[PDB]
Structure formats: C-alpha cells, structure tokens
Amino acid sequence: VTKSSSLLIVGAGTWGTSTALHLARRGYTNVTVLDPYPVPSAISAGNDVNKVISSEVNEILAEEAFNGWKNDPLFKPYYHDTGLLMSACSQEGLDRLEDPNLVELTRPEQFRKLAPEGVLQGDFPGWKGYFARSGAGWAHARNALVAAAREAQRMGVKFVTGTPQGRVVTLIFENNDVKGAVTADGKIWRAERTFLCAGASAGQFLDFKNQLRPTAWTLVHIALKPEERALYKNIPVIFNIERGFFFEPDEERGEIKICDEHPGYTNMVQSADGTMMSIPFEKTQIPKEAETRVRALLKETMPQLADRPFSFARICWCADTANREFLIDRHPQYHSLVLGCGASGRGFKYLPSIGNLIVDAMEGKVPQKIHELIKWNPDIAANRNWRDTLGRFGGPNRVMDFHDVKEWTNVQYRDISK
C-alpha cells in the first residue's frame, strides 16, 4: 500500500466521507467512493438538518471529535454551541445519564426558563436532569457531510454516486480476500484496500458473525410560521432519554426537528435458509406509534406545537454492535478489507475525526487499548440478544420490529438528496 494505491470506499455516508476526507488529507491520491445515492445520501443517517454534539477510549475519541467541531475550519461553520439539557423521568433513566457549566434541574420552572418565555410552555412533569450551558449543542449534519465530501473531492477523491453506477452489488471475493467491489451497472472496481462504510447496509456484503444489528429510529419536522420563528432561535438542545429531543428551527424552512426516544425498530427478514437478518429500507414516513410519541413529548415541552401537522418525516437507520462499541478494524481473514461501521446510533458527532481512526486501522497504527475496544469481535456477538435495548429507553421500552407496524404517517415527500 502506497499513497497512489487504488483505495475503494463502499458508502459515501458519515463514516465513508470522513474516511475519504482523511485519506485525502494524509496524501492518498487514488481514492474512489461508491454510493447508490447522490451526496448527501437520502439513506445516510448523517443526512439530517441537525444532530446532537456533546463534550477511557470513548473519552479520547469523543475529545478528538469535539476538537474537530471547535477547531477544524472545515467543520466549525456547522457547529452551534447552544448548550444541551440531558434529562430523564425515572431513576433508571436518570442513572443512565465540579463542572462550572453543568447545573441540576428538578423543577418545571427551571426547565421552562431554558428558553425565552413562550417557547417551553410545558409542565415537564417529573423531568429531572442536567443542563450543560456550553461545550455541547448541535451540528448541521447534512451541510457538514456535504462540506466534507466536497473537500475530499477537491483534494482528488472520486465520488461515483447514484444508481446503478454507485450501487455495490457484491464485494469481489478472490482467494479468501476482498479485491474491490462490483457495481449494479456491471462495473468492476479493483482496489488494493476496500473500506466497508455502508452503515446499516454493511451486513449485505459479508458475514459479520452476528456483530451488527441494523436498527431504525424516527424523526419529524414541524414548520414554524415566519413570524413565530425568531422566538425559538438559539434555544439549547432539549433531550430526555425516555421521551425524545428537539432543536432550534433550521434556517432553510424554519423547521424544528424532533425525535421520539425508543430502543429502535428492526426489520427481521426470513430467508429460505431459515436464518434471521435485519434488512434496512428507505421510508419517508414513520410508524403511527412514533407520531404519538413525538406528540406526547411536545405536550410535555412545547404543547403549543403538539397538534401541528408534520412537514417531513422519515425513518433513519444505523447498526448496533452487541455493546454499542465501534467496529473499526482490518478483517481477520480478508487481508485487504477494512471495516468502518457499527456506529451504534452514536456516530455522527465523529464525522470530523473518525476517518483518521479508520485510516489508522488500514495502516496498522491503532493504539492497542483503543484497538481492543473497536476490534472485529465475534465472541461478543455469540448467542446474541437481538432484543437487547442497549441502554435505550422510551415508548414500549423494548426493541420493536417494522413487521409489527400496522399504520404509517402520510406526510408529503421531500427528496433530501436534493
């Protein structure tokens, strides 16, 4: 492997793009990224108007990520240090999650005062939590993803996007190694190293030995009237581990993005084999139960918006490892394959930095203690509890399945790939 080696990245999502960017920064000149959707991909979990950005191996990686948001001029424009409320309703939730910038809240009036009067009109019944006044906030996830991809491209990376030209249909398996990939147009992409960064779809392409559970969450937007927008500007991110979270309205459309908290949805599919796999799919709607949960959250916080029609809704997929640690490693058998996946529903904040760790994995530079946590680890996924809620709360307090969903929302379509 040399700086001019053919390198192939499967997936131009959060981590594929971070990888492309960091390969280019570190001087690689022959990188190609494949994706079935134009950047920003409509199925990328990173393609969102906002994500929560906050802030031991996890502390090291989180520190590097946050440093990118604060100090890397490519990423700085997208980060808003609004502060963040982290709250819960039960002791179990509170347990789950001297700093001068952290305050405890236990009283409804304290919650209401986190925003200008007229914004947080709710009763916050039994809400208790911690408010970080700074050093946490939100990033414009889609704009940051696009910025990173365009900077990678500027530095020589070739993005081949859209279907069929960017849709990988198989990796090239030759003499027990991965030699590249083949796209749906029937084009062979040979590479000295292949990075698998297909997020929730990564399991399509090889046997992860139960290490990945593709799992989906839910989001909506509510459009504020032009007059009512100013009042909601610069509010801190409001997050309750057992209810959901929301952000100040975006600029483009004055839309407040809201997520209901729950342990997620799988889509378990039965093969002729009889084996069981969670298979992701695009849907620009959410289950009716998710709508209900969103509206119950709004009742408790911004009741004046609780009955407003949604302007956009979608499911959003990631993939959980058995302990929600990342899966970033060289494959133990396929010498040329590098995994950059298992973001476990928490990978967006690592956009500025995770590509460095993935490249380090390819190059054999990962510190041993870090490697031990993120390595290929089938032992951890043996006898897997696929219904493990993995520290997630809300709604049914169980992992549910889309096969059980009877009714979906019927919100207007929007093409978020532009």
Which residues contribute to the site for ligand FAD (CB under 6 A)? 10-16, 34-37, 41, 43-46, 51-52, 167-168, 197-201, 217, 219, 259, 316, 318, 341, 343, 345-349
Q: How far is the CB of 98 from ligand FAD (least distance, A)?
A: 26
Instruction: Say if residue 382 carries a ligand binding annotation.
Output: no
Binding residue per annotation — 14?
Answer: yes
Q: Residue 405 annotated as binding?
A: no
Q: Does 168 show up as a binding residue in the annotation?
A: yes
Nearest approach in angstroms of CB 119 to ligand FAD is 20
Select 14 or 82, whichever has its Cβ closest to ligand FAD: 14
Q: Is 313 annotated as belonging to a binding site?
A: no
Min dist. Cβ of residue 225 to ligand FAD (A): 25
Which residue lies nearer to ligand FAD by CB, 64 or 126? 64
318 in a known ligand binding site: yes
Q: How far is the CB of 301 from ligand FAD (least distance, A)?
A: 17
17 assigned to a ligand binding site:
no
* Beta strands per DSSP E along 293-417: 312-320, 327-330, 337-341, 400-401
Q: Return the number of the residue (86 or 366) whose C-beta is nearest ligand FAD.
A: 86
Q: Could you tell me which residues are beta bridge partners of residue 57?
A: none
Q: Specify burial of residue 403 (Cβ count, 10 A radius: 0-12, 13-18, 19+).
A: exposed
Q: Smallest Cα–Cα separation from 46: which of 35, 58, 57?
A: 35
DSSP H stretches of helix in 272-353: 288-301
- Residue 324 makes CB contacts below 8 A (sequence gap 6+) with 344, 345, 346, 390, 391
Alpha-carbon span 128 to 416, nearest angstrom: 35
348 annotated as ligand-binding: yes
Q: Which amino acid is at 33?
A: V
| Nearer to ligand FAD (CB atom), residue 112 or residue 414 | 414
CB within 8 A of 327, min separation 6: which ones? 208, 211, 212, 321, 339, 340, 341, 342, 374, 376, 377
Which C-beta is closer to ligand FAD: that of 9 or that of 119? Answer: 9
Q: How far is the CB of 46 from ligand FAD (least distance, A)?
A: 4
Residue nearest ligand FAD (C-beta atom): 13
Any idea which residue has 């001297």 for tokens?
Answer: 98
Distance CA 178, CA 333 (A): 10
Contact 58, 34 (CB under 8 A): no
In the numeric block, which tokens belong to residue 363?
Answer: 């190059």
Annotated ligand binding at 344? The verdict is no
158 labelled binding-site residue: no
Which one, 97 or 126, has the nearer CB to ligand FAD?
A: 97
Q: Least distance in Å: CB of 148 to ligand FAD?
A: 11
Residue carrying the six token digits 């408010």: 131
- Contacts of residue 155, defined as CB under 8 A and 6 or more positions apart, other chains included, come to 21, 24, 25
CB closer to ligand FAD, 316 vs 357: 316
Token pair of 65 as six digits: 């990520």
Contact 166, 160 (CB under 8 A): yes
Taking the complex as a whole, the smallest distance from the CB of residue 192 to ligand FAD amounts, in Å, to: 19
User: In the bound complex, what is the minimum distance in angstroms from residue 19's beta carbon to ligand FAD?
Assistant: 9
By beta-carbon proximity to ligand FAD, the closer residue of 315 and 370 is 315
Nearest to 8, CA basis, from 162, 183, 145: 183
- What is the rounded CA–CA span in Å between residue 316 and residue 28? 32
- Binding residues for FAD, as ranges, are 14-15, 35, 41, 44-45, 52, 168, 318, 347-349
